[model samples]
Target chain A: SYFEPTGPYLMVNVTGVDGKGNELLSPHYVEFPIKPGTTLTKEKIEYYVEWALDATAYKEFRVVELDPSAKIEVTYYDKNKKKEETKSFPITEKGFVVPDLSEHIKNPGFNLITKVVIEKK
Target chain B: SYFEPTGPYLMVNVTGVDGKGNELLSPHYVEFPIKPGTTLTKEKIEYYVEWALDATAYKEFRVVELDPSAKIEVTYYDKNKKKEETKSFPITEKGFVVPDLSEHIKNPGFNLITKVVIEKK
Candidate 1:
């Protein structure tokens, strides 16, 4: 039987690179179904990163092995043209230090994006 | 590598009964992770129902073929003991008509549960 999807799917695009600042693999995109009342954790982000790297040429590398100071960049609309801006969060030993994207996840239109590029040292 | 769960997981328990008033299968339980700023949809609930029945003795049955008027029972603590009550929603042709569970899902522990029983016509 076919099942419809509960919406507000997070469109994630992650890019991996080499220590020399060269592209390790092509950018990968994946849609994640975000359920209500949940927090996006570091482990989950790792899963998403691994999922992104799974089919790529550089499948041997892991997110943790890259630069710890890397960040996840998000582009979301906050209504006001000025407020509709891009935000970035640093990746630490803990995981992705992300901000709340509940508003964008619940209400989608022209303003929501999960674009990330891992910078290796 | 082992990954930790981004919890605030929804604990779901579902039971099935035969048209003849006999037990179709034993009750089953499963945990679903909820991501922030997402809405729970009918299709997702259907997937959860099927998942609950997957390993059961009545694996052949489907939720949609059962009672459409059946409801999903949720038990949550709303702070006050009196307010900490059980609520339910009807399952329709569209899907489960559930309320916003963001609060319960985000702030779990004393308040949260998902229990259901499908009756065959």
Candidate 2:
């Protein structure tokens, strides 16, 4: 139920900036709801490995596959940790969200299956 | 605390046979004794993926890294489900066990970091 908790991580783009035009801190790592024992391809791993390396400030990573029909909903948070935007989309059949079709729309964000947000208590 | 439990397993070369001259069942997995969050090479994975596939009746797999100085001790069983033999080795830096240099020195066995044996009660 847990992905590997150590590095190297996929240093990805920020989903949304904080109120002061900063970046969110917690749950910043890209996440995929992968179950264990999932079958994946070498090319699939390579492509993502290359893509994830483009990220910044990443601290961890994982590998798994979802049903071809899996759906992902990502929410962006602004300063004060308020919900800034929410977007849902199926991973492209080839499993990629290029800059144009990426969630940030205006720019780019984490390329992942599920993105969890954590608010400081 | 656990490696991915699901397959595809390495189905690697086994270390020894059971009392019936058959392979051990439970704990038959090639336990690499890896800790999560480890960095690994694509070529290393590919080499083992191919090696593990040569295993028979494997139903599980995992990915992780071990210390270069790690030592693994594997015990083989005989037809009477008795301790047939035990051998230990370091994961070659290149991470492989060719037929001859592999654990089952006589022939071939599991080419893994740790190969546990299971006996039927």
Candidate 3:
């Protein structure tokens, strides 16, 4: 099966990094395993991104569940590229996670995206 | 990809025909396409069942979003088998469909199932 056997499956639309808009470089919509009752964290989002899209760097995340201004943004250095970069992805607030993911996805027809994470070879 | 390009996807768990426990014969969990703004009809549910699980007959569907007893059931004749049968699956009410699917899946951790449609060889 394309999906993991055990999955609540987050159907995600991984848009590339903030300001770059490279959805072409990523899976447009992909399903990923979401462990039962797990909270979504920045780290966890990064893990999913890497596993599904092969993106190692996470920068910011946004969802219609949040206020228009409430995107989660962070900065990290690309060790391989030897440059500091600002990236974006989702689930910054501990309030939103798998347990309540349906709530977040309700507003926009269940599509999700995070900013570009330049693919690693 | 396991999903269609135009999907917002209904991540469904196809439980076997009602009163029988054979989730084993069906796709335990599967994703099916949802067209934007389409109201779910019994016909649509049957279509997804046939497309996703190869089960041509559909009987009833239940979700936590509905009252505990609010399952939709239907009866039909199996021409190939020359027998009358009842099957079950989801989305009986016109009120629930693609536009607000997240609402129905909001409860019970977003898992969905309908009754056994005994597999067709």
Candidate 4:
């Protein structure tokens, strides 16, 4: 008998923290795919923050915690070379914050925080 | 006297390797700003691979080496809160590969490998 494995979906929780590390907001969950071996440097994080603040379209804040054990799996195929590889790794964490205050003050401050997670099968 | 600082740009190099870790490709250099506290995980790497493969628009391959010492710095401003924060960190690394063969074979196989780097001042 032969069996095949699938997916590596991600589940993430974003929480707000005070200087003391006290939780200031509720946890939010979102799922996406884990990108391996990539490190989103400080510039990217700031860009995200700027984007979030300018867009005022969603919550924005740095990630306070991350579960590295998160992962996903997929069938990789190279039609031309007739090659494929399958592997997995822990999901890395990157955090940022929103700059605009109007959105939170006018809307809901609690909604200003944000988090992103990924998984695949 | 007073001095204000700026910038957190990026500098990256992508290299290719054989099963034995022999260098198979020449290194390329590109620079962009650092994205603070962000981690590009496995799924994102796969997506990049798929995109590189499908686009056949650019060289594609996984990264074999990463220098975390890469970094940058920027001034953080909170207009409403009248507050600002400045910080920096090493660039994280995530690797991926291209799927197509014609591009490398027909074009230049050596061009298939890629690397990304970040830096700031």
Best by lDDT: 1
Report the C-alpha lDDT of model 2 over A18-113, residue by residue, as the tens digit: 222222222235433232233334345334533442352222332222234434444445445455866555545354332232222322233343
Docking category for candidate 4? incorrect
- Cα displacement (angstroms), candidate 3, residue B91, comes to 39
Q: What TM-score is obtained for chain B in each of the predicted models? A: 0.52, 0.26, 0.44, 0.31
lDDT of 3 at A119: 38
* DockQ of the two-chain complex in candidate 2: 0.01
B1-121 in candidate 1: lDDT tens per residue? Answer: 1443344454555556544555556556556655322334556666667776766665665664444454555566665344776655444444321233434443331112233444432
- Model 4 residue A50 distance off true place after TM-score fit, in angstroms: 14
- Cα deviation at B94, candidate 4, in Å, is 11
Preferred candidate (DockQ higher): 3 or 4 = 3
DockQ by candidate, in order: 0.01, 0.01, 0.02, 0.01
Please identify which of the two predictions, 2 or 3, would achieve the higher TM-score against the true structure. Answer: 3
Q: Over 4 Å off in model 4, which ranges? A: A1-59, A62-121, B1-10, B32-39, B42-121
Decide which is better by TM-score, 1 or 2: 1
> Of the candidates shown, which would achieve the greatest TM-score relative to the real structure?
1
Q: Per-residue lDDT for A1-121 in model 3, tens only?
A: 5633342455555555433444444545566555422446654555555555533233233221222232333344545577765423345644232221221222112234555444334
Minimum summed lDDT over a 10-residue window in model 1 chain B is located at B106-115
For each candidate in turn, give its C-alpha RMSD to the true structure in angstroms.
18.6, 19.5, 19.3, 23.9
Model 3 whole-model lDDT (C-alpha atoms): 0.41
TM-score per model over all chains = 0.34, 0.22, 0.28, 0.23
